[PDB]
Amino acid sequence: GHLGFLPRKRAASIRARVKAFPKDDRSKPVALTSFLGYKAGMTTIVRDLDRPGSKFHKREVVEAVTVVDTPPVVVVGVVGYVETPRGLRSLTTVWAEHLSDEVKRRFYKNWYKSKKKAFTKYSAKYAQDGAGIERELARIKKYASVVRVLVHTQIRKTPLAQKKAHLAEIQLNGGSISEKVDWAREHFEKTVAVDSVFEQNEMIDAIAVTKGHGQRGYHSRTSINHKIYRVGKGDDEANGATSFDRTKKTITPMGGFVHYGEIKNDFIMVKGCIPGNRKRIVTLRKSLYTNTSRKALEEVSLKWIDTASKFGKGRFQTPAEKHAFMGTLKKDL
RNA sequence: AUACCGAAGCAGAAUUCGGUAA
RNA sequence: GAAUGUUACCGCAAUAGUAAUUGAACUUAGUACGAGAGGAACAGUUCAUUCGGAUAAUUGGUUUGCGGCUGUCUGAUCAGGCAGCCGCGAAGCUACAUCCGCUGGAUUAUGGCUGAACCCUCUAAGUCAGAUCCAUGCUAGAACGCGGUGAUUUCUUUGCUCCACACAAUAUAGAUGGAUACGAAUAAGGCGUCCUUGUGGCGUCGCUGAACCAUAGCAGGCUAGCAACGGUGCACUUGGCGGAAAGGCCUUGGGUGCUUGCUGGCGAAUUGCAAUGUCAUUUUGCGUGGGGAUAAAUCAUUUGUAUACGACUUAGAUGUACAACGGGGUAUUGUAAGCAGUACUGCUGAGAUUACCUUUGUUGUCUGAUUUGU
Numbered sequence: 209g210h211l212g213f214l215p216r217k218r219a220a221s222i223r224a225r226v227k228a229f230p231k232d233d234r235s236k237p238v239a240l241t242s243f244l245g246y247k248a249g250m251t252t253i254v255r256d257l258d259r260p261g262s263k264f265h266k267r268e269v270v271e272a273v274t275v276v277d278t279p280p281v282v283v284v285g286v287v288g289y290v291e292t293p294r295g296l297r298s299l300t301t302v303w304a305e306h307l308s309d310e311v312k313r314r315f316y317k318n319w320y321k322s323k324k325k326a327f328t329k330y331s332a333k334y335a336q337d338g339a340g341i342e343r344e345l346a347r348i349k350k351y352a353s354v355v356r357v358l359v360h361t362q363i364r365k366t367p368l369a370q371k372k373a374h375l376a377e378i379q380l381n382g383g384s385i386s387e388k389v390d391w392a393r394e395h396f397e398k399t400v401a402v403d404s405v406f407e408q409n410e411m412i413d414a415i416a417v418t419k420g421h422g423q424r425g426y427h428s429r430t431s432i433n434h435k436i437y438r439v440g441k442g443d444d445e446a447n448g449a450t451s452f453d454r455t456k457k458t459i460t461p462m463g464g465f466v467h468y469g470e471i472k473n474d475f476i477m478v479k480g481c482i483p484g485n486r487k488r489i490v491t492l493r494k495s496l497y498t499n500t501s502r503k504a505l506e507e508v509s510l511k512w513i514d515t516a517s518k519f520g521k522g523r524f525q526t527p528a529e530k531h532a533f534m535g536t537l538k539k540d541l
Numbered sequence: 542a543u544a545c546c547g548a549a550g551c552a553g554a555a556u557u558c559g560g561u562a563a
Numbered sequence: 564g565a566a567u568g569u570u571a572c573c574g575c576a577a578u579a580g581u582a583a584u585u586g587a588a589c590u591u592a593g594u595a596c597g598a599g600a601g602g603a604a605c606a607g608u609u610c611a612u613u614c615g616g617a618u619a620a621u622u623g624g625u626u627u628g629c630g631g632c633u634g635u636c637u638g639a640u641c642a643g644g645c646a647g648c649c650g651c652g653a654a655g656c657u658a659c660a661u662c663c664g665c666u667g668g669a670u671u672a673u674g675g676c677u678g679a680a681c682c683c684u685c686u687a688a689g690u691c692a693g694a695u696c697c698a699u700g701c702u703a704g705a706a707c708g709c710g711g712u713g714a715u716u717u718c719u720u721u722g723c724u725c726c727a728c729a730c731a732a733u734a735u736a737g738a739u740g741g742a743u744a745c746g747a748a749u750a751a752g753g754c755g756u757c758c759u760u761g762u763g764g765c766g767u768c769g770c771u772g773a774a775c776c777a778u779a780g781c782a783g784g785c786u787a788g789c790a791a792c793g794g795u796g797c798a799c800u801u802g803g804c805g806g807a808a809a810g811g812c813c814u815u816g817g818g819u820g821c822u823u824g825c826u827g828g829c830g831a832a833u834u835g836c837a838a839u840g841u842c843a844u845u846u847u848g849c850g851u852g853g854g855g856a857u858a859a860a861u862c863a864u865u866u867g868u869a870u871a872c873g874a875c876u877u878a879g880a881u882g883u884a885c886a887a888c889g890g891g892g893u894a895u896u897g898u899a900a901g902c903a904g905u906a907c908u909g910c911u912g913a914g915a916u917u918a919c920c921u922u923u924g925u926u927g928u929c930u931g932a933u934u935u936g937u
Contacts, residue, residue: 210615212581213702220704222868222876227576228700247868252620261589261609272620272661287574287711292807294709295575299806301711315572315713318860320879320929325858327713351806358573367920369866370877371884377573415701418617421657422870429616430701433663463893464920468868480662481618487868487876496665496700502608514620519919520653520894522621527892534912 218426223374223489224415225428230496232354234383238391240357240405241379242493245278245476246366247416248469248486251459252514253437253477259502268511273437274482275459276490278474279362281400284311286392287377288352288385299351301358302344303327304396305334310363310373348389355380355388359400361489365473374489402439402474406492409507410436413495416484429483432495435503438510440475447475452511462517462524477510 229241253273257264285303289296312326313319334341348355360375380388406412413432420426440447446456464470469486482490498504516522524530 210580210582210702212583213616214580215703217703218869218875220875225574231699250618250620259609263610265609270620272618274618274620289575290806292575292710294807295577297709297806298574298711301573303712307713312713315570316859317571317877318879320884321931322860323714323858325714329856330713347806351809356574368868368877369885372877375573416617417868420869420875425617426869426875427616428702431617431663432665432700461893461920463891466893467919470920481620483617485618485868499665517893517919518619519917521651523894536910537913538910539914 213427213429216423216427218420218423219417219428222417223376224417224430224491226376226415226491226493228496229379230381230494232379232383233381236381236383238380238382238387240281240400241381242491243278243402243405243412244281244359244361244374244376244378244489244491245276246361246368247482247484247488247490248275248277248471248475249461249465249467249518250274250481251461252512253510254512255437255508255510258506258508270512271479272481273477273479275440275469275471276476276478276482276492277366277469277471278402278440278476279365280474281359282308282362283357283359283392283395283398283400284375285358285396286348286389287356287358288348288389289354289356290351291353296354300344300348302341302348303330303358305331306397307331308360308373310371311360311375313372314360314375345389345393349386352385352389355385355392357392357395362473367468367470367472368487376491402441402476406436406439406476406494408436408439409505411495411498411504412436412478413493414478414482414490415493416482416488416490418483419485431480431483433499433504434482434495435479435508437477437479437508440477442471442473442475448513450510450513452509453513457515457526459513459515461515462526463519466518 226242251273252270254268254270257267257269259265283304284307285301287298287301290299307327312324315326316322316324333339356377356379358375358377360373363373364371380392382388382391412434413430414434415428415430418425418427418429438450440459442459445458447459448457458471459475460471465486467486476492478492484490515525517524
């Protein structure tokens, strides 16, 4: 057994705690250092191997790729940090004036029984000329060194019975922390898309809690060197609008995703599998730095995508395939 | 446990020796 | 899972566990070498084996649900009620399935530079290249670590909280004028000045704080006069600085006492020759007035990512919120009940189930007990 991955004690929460960020680039424009989303099932994808010298070089090759259910990231605040001899410390936290019901639920377990006195008087302080809630920005500018944005996911968009919001801190790539806080404030209550941070062929890393076998499993894990193959937009239609297979369909498997994960929002395709099963929230990061190897730098296309259901063994790809061979079906037509 | 140095009439391949190190 | 404020969310990390590993192919190659066969090599690329984490794209040992097969039989073909067998296949157990498994410093052995010991010297003063130690990363989080943040019982007869005054208990790891702020060197640094502004010139300081600020009044009162509007106890007000443990530093203007800077008038006694002769706050308790806000958690209900049992993850006090359904998709089966007679033929790839998604219309529910609170 691995010595580093011991003891095997289970994680304390579904969300995996991120404790490392890709340094701090003082020259890059302001951008998010990571992304948050939810994990769906898995599928299959094939692409052309442009890698030189490979056995399957310049040939179509099948690769296993998972699908991450990514809801839009709506900013709710930002957190500043200051260097100290006792380690990094969060000097001040601020919020985006207004908070959705899902965000308020995160602070409540018996939400229905509670009088729902969530963020309210704080908004009353904001409901004026600003003063303290505006001087906090100046205080952050004066002393802060690294600023982490505070965002939550649109859980109600995800097909999850649990409507409680999930929130985590994300560091800002850009320098000039004044610009960091200015951009964060301007983005208060705004919605951020995947294209604003990640991009196709980027070697992102995945971190999440492992599957529980029902103590084996249910522990946080980090997987690095995973290449994105296509930015997905499940809000629209015809997600399979690739250059090949001009018979546009949807990435959703027949009858919906197995067990759970009926995609109804943005999604992303990532090379290989991801730790943990569906219904688990997964955070994405740029993998610190980008390797210069062809396996990490080369860009890839996409073609065949499997759509047959897995509620059994799998056969039918689309409902329109059932005709001709079955003759008459008086029960239906 | 593998390799890093100096030497051999060590052309190359290849081989041996003194030190580091398990 | 027990305790410091109540509860909960997002964070930091003192600390500890460390992780990768070997071979193979191209191009540098038939190149340098070399009579000759034979055959280097850095760097750039492509794969798998040893080991580790994952998930099921596929595979794999792994809902009597669909077709029919035997027996006890309803009378009788339609039914298997009871005990199972041949094809398809999940649900999980669970691997013979798949991907991935990182880049920066200081060193040493070692190769040099400057340069004495005494021409030389990689070493004595230092330094460049350079594998063992630490960093990056991953895993847990002091449950005897820390920061920020959502809210602070509308009646315990202001209940909670911060303040003003106001009486007690509680004790001190131990006041009895003042922690009375640069940096850098110790084979030199300040101070005041000059400036043709520098590693500069001039005068000079240390050799201890054995000092600096203050220190006089019944333990510190009343009052009179002189010189200035300086010093200072205290309530305000304009503004700046301090985020490392900033929680302090002040700054403008008056207001109000003292002023021992100087000169006078008042009382000190009896504690009897002394008995620390009681003056600081740390915490907590009770009595009023000046304001501020009025919430949260457990069980229940349940969920299924979780699941040996705990635990964990959820939904709900009026909106497609919770949940039933048949429908729809999904998976499965290949000729079912009968009727058309030509000794199996059209309905009939049929009906069909469907613990996965789906909940479109109807329909039912939406209200309880306990606890917390500086």
